[PDB]
Symmetry: C3
Subunit: 308 residues, 3 copies
């Protein structure tokens, strides 16, 4: 089974530019080379070419609706192609508005996949609940079958069709949820392990419960959307929306090591790394190196060691 890296240098999902430099920063740190040192065969698709859309006026509150919807439509078609060729897809973010396209194309080939969303935010605001118009905080809303038609059709996402139900997703790391988002998850009954559950159960018991909840009935493809700001700002400083009291370096590597070991990883996202957002160059290097550490962990690198 081979790995396919896909660059998604996108920033229209939010206001801060620079996140579109995440793919390259990740590559600068030597992500591809280190990945070839693993058991997987690695192919690099390069970065997608996103067509800026000139007259992209806000749909009500939603900003850059057409740019975001057009960029995700491309990503889906690409991801669906590599999943269609039996390869694990690895999308390097820009912002997480690209998760819409990553999960969508992936779910076209493996419509039975589950989603593990490591993040400090649920990103489940709908065009009507979002306090800001940033689409990097509404991905999940465009994908959930239950939310289908709960908000007006947004220009650019007509190609979208909810692919997952509230039962196929599990959140890990939550510590910054909005009233609407919180109402949504409690009503739809989405499974989540916010920081308070990681503090109560411990990350080991969390992964165990995540797996039996998602893979208990049948083993199926896993799709991990890791948002760099899921870990504490002491580890991943260079992120647009940092929240204190998050996951530790260890707990992060633990989640990816457990997902690796399940042998079910099918799709992977490394989002929200903004190479221009730390306080110092070291904060950036720190954020990037840990992002690479997590991607490598998802593909075999164990802390106990490794040998051929």
């Amino acid at each position: 089974k081979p790995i396919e890296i896909i660059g998604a240098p996108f920033s229209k999902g939010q206001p801060r530019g620079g996140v579109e430099k995440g793919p390259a920063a990740l590559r600068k740190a030597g992500l591809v080379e280190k990945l070839k040192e693993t058991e997987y065969n690695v192919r690099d698709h390069g970065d997608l070419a996103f067509v800026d859309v000139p007259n992209d006026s806000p749909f009500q509150i939603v900003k850059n609706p057409r740019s975001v919807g057009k960029a995700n439509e491309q990503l889906a078609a690409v991801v669906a192609e590599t999943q269609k060729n039996g390869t694990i897809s690895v999308v390097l973010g820009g912002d997480e508005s690209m998760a819409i396209g990553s999960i969508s194309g992936h779910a076209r080939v493996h419509p039975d996949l589950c989603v593990i969303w490591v993040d400090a935010h649920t990103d489940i605001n709908t065009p009507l609940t979002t306090s800001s118009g940033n689409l990097h905080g509404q991905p999940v809303a465009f994908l959930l079958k239950e939310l289908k038609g709960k908000f007006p059709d947004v220009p650019g996402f007509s190609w979208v069709t909810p692919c997952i139900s509230a039962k196929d997703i599990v959140y890990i790391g939550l510590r910054d949820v909005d009233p609407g988002e919180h109402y949504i998850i409690k009503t739809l009954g989405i499974k989540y392990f916010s920081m308070t559950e990681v503090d109560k159960l411990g990350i080991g018991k969390v992964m165990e419960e995540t797996f039996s909840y998602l893979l208990g009935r049948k083993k199926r493809p896993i799709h991990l959307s890791f948002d760099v700001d899921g870990l504490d700002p002491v580890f991943t400083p260079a992120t647009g929306t940092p929240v204190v009291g998050g996951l530790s370096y260890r707990e992060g590597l633990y989640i990816t090591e457990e997902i690796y070991k399940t042998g079910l990883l099918s799709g992977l996202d490394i989002m929200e790394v903004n190479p221009t957002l730390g306080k110092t160059p070291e904060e950036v290097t720190r954020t990037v190196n840990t992002a690479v550490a997590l991607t490598l962990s998802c593909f075999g690198t164990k802390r106990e060691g490794n040998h051929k």
Copy 2:
């Protein structure tokens, strides 16, 4: 059920002045406003006016015995009044020598309450065991029925009458206990979860065991005395007596979230925040903001999110 904030800008319980600025710093950070954003109705009593006592010579080793005893006598009368009016009292410290008065007035109305003392210190030195004469480290000794008459009567605290027994208190966070204090807790058999027990059990299992130990026989009012230095100096830098290897931001918020959820919080203390003690202005802001985070957590703010 309403909340009543009570400012206790006191510093005679120790040598460093500045802690009496804790109430205002807390208010500066917007504590009252953020509290009104919760389900509770909030009232602010303001800061008590403490009468300095001119000829306050040390009673043996005990310093400022009359100032401390007079200030706590006032606080009790106030707290007893608001508890008497069915309102949860929130005392903002100065130093924790004010816990004597907070718990005392509270126990007048709800004589059945239990005490959860989050701190790196037991603060159970008696006027005869204390190596220094600082009364912020002897509060518990003036309140424990078992210690009644175990030390000479200290000027200013005649109005005091032990209100709680060794069985009604639980410590969390200990990592700096004196020989006398340690002898006291092991003989009286006071329940405690020092740092080594948090490391062994995990904070989730700690709160569980704290609750079944205190509320196992009958649900009763809870009195939480949170000493800002219960958390590691990486989180609450601006404190008079910092000790390394303490509670994390997460474990602290976890304790308050669990106490909130019990629905039994009746009295709350936020002590030892000294706005003039960090190394930088950020260390102060850090200490204060986390203090506010804990007070808000005690009143409903969950990390998983909230909605009306």
Copy 3:
């Protein structure tokens, strides 16, 4: 039962000099004085005098083979002498190539001892697997009976005879293991709790499982080789080979407090403290003070407190 401190100011086990200053730094911090404040009677043997060996050419890849082998031969004879006099030996490192001599002399008197190796590295490379020729990363290989004759005889260590089997050692803290080392531990089946197992089980459950695994059949002398770099570089900065995502201050003190409580500690090593390796003087003081904290914890100092 008395304590015997033994200075092992050695640096030939690696390239960076300065680690030979570890004993003195440790003494500067007041290790001996603080140790006399405990229940144990303390004696200080001083620092061993290591004879530099002029024509110490590399045995194949192994560097300073004769210096290292001669220095460890002396240490064994010393340790065997104090163990022979019924005293717990405390060796202050230089580098951990001295563990060979510490464990060897110790095993001469208590051939039934088990070994708890707290470290980020397994240090089990053999002269043939080691990528560098540094002997501070091959100690375990010279001691394991199973590895006897698995590599050519190294000049200077003829006096050595494997004293422990794969079943008598337990690792704690691993997060940087080499392919050879990993093959060795998985084939010989050595018991280990790498960082991923500490994250999954928690340090409390780790010590429990360490003790029942080593002391389950019969209580026997324990030999703890603590490598300062077993704790995260945020705690022990001044170390030659720091690895991110390690043990916390608390987890470290927890391991030593549990080993103390077993009452079986017979040999202790405090290795890899290099007084000339931090980024600032505070990083050094931090490393040293925590090293002393761990040694004191191994001898009775509890975080819950202590009294006579």
